[PDB]
């Protein structure tokens, strides 16, 4: 024929897919992509961040120097992994505001320690305990110094250590609550102890409380742990009458990208930039539903397990 028909049209595919718009709950388009990461790798990737496996050790124990945590001295991390089955195995302790100290140290990204030459005259250093066995031998937290009488006295201790560095020093120290007056006087001459740690701008005094607590690794006594931050130009001063569990030095606070996370999933040899307790997750989608606890370059956690974004036109197969 001497005319013509010219038809206009668009494509379609056989197996299309449903999405939501402002107009429809469900409408078929040619293609779409998932915006929510639902699936985890199942392991924690050893790259690209520096991951450190607590194994049997909590972050705090690693830093105090519980003997079974000796392998962690010297270590630093982007992310420290704490396991459910971690245990303490030194002298039973407690920390008022444990969480804050765990956070401060986690954040700092190291348990590397810098010993200082504190001199403690008229007392015996390096107190040991059968609760805290390093080898066959009685021992103690490696970053702490248990002080007791020398001979038949324990004099008022009055010790300084100035901070002449560029940075804030973090000092960990403690006090011993014994289980009996007889054990009090035996270890420290005085019947009541005291510890006063001060700087130019702050101070904390603790008095120990004699008496039985439940037995833990053959001990009904306890140690309470405290910390003190000492600024540049400032001065640490320690004043004690008895019962002091003394610092051996300082931790350096770095301002860090570092953290700590509780997880039981194994660490394995792969690569990723976002970590959760369920394992590492992929990074390419904008949202995820795996865990609200994340570390690294992470999609944002939301409650939905799926969201479909159209990447093609309305799909209209033959009617």
């Amino acid at each position: 024929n001497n005319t013509a028909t010219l038809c206009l049209g668009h494509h379609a595919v056989a197996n299309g897919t449903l999405v939501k718009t402002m107009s429809d709950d469900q409408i078929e388009v040619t293609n779409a992509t998932e915006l929510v990461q639902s699936i985890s790798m199942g392991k924690i990737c050893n790259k690209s961040y520096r991951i450190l496996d607590g194994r049997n050790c909590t972050l705090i124990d690693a830093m105090l120097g519980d003997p079974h945590c000796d392998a962690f001295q010297y270590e630093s991390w982007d992310l420290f992994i704490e396991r459910s089955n971690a245990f303490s195995n030194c002298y039973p302790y407690d920390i008022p505001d444990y969480a804050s100290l765990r956070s401060i140290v986690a954040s700092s990204g190291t348990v590397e320690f810098t010993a200082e030459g504190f001199t403690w005259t008229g007392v015996t250093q390096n107190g040991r305990s059968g609760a805290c066995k390093r080898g066959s031998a009685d021992s103690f937290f490696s970053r702490l110094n248990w002080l007791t009488k020398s001979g038949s006295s324990y004099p008022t201790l009055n010790v300084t250590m100035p901070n002449n560095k560029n940075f804030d020093k973090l000092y960990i120290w403690g006090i011993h609550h014994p289980s009996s007056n007889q054990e009090q006087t035996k270890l420290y001459i005085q019947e009541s102890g005291r510890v006063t740690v001060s700087t130019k701008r702050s101070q904390q005094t603790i008095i120990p409380n004699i008496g039985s607590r439940p037995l833990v690794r053959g001990q009904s006594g306890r140690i309470s742990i405290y910390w003190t931050i000492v600024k540049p130009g400032d001065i640490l001063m320690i004043n004690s009458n008895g019962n002091l569990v003394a610092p051996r030095g300082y931790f350096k606070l770095n301002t860090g990208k570092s953290s700590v996370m509780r997880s039981d999933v194994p660490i394995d040899i792969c690569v990723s930039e976002c970590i959760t307790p369920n394992g590492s997750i992929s990074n390419d989608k904008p949202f995820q539903n795996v865990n609200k606890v994340t570390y690294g370059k992470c999609p944002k956690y939301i409650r939905q397990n799926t969201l479909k974004l159209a990447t093609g036109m309305r799909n209209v197969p033959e009617k």
Partner: protein, 175 residues
């Protein structure tokens, strides 16, 4: 869609067009044929590629934060940590839901528009030498070989050339 082209006057899509997203089929003196329109296909795709990037900034690093799971009851401070995390998650969940709906609506509507735009552009060229059949096709009142159909697809079709011929064929009537 707001233009009523796709799933409207265009009764349906073509599974046989692998060449592009939009285009033409035709029947003329040399039989039948098909061609994709690349301009309009590319106009769609450019809008849809990296769509989400225009709203969300590339994913940011976040390091130490607050704890979100607790092994003991504590009261006030834990209540607040919990409520903060909940508040945040709910707000983002809302965001992501709305974003999807918006973006998709936009996507549906812009692709309808490209189709309509191409129909319109074609009609405009043809001018009085053709008729809108109502189903996305044009009836052209003259011998239009492949070269001529090619001229319409490329935007070079001179309608004055065919006008007298299309007049004769159109107006073979009255009665």
């Amino acid at each position: 869609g707001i233009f009523g082209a796709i799933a409207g006057f265009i009764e349906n899509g073509w599974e046989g067009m692998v060449d592009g997203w939009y285009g033409f089929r035709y029947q003329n003196s040399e039989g039948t044929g098909q061609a994709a329109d690349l301009k309009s296909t590319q106009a769609a795709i450019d809008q849809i590629n990296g769509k989400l990037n225009r709203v969300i900034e590339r994913t940011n690093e976040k390091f130490h934060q607050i704890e979100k799971e607790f092994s003991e009851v504590e009261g006030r401070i834990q209540d607040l940590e919990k409520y903060v995390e909940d508040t945040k998650i709910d707000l983002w969940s809302y965001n992501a839901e709305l974003l999807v709906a918006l973006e998709n609506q936009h996507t549906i509507d812009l692709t309808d528009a490209e189709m309509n735009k191409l129909f319109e552009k074609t009609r405009r060229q043809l001018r009085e030498n053709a008729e809108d059949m109502g189903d996305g096709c044009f009836k052209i009142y003259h011998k239009c070989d492949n070269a001529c159909i090619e001229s319409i697809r490329t935007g070079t079709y001179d309608h004055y050339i065919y006008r007298d011929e299309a007049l004769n064929n159109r107006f073979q009537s009255g009665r």
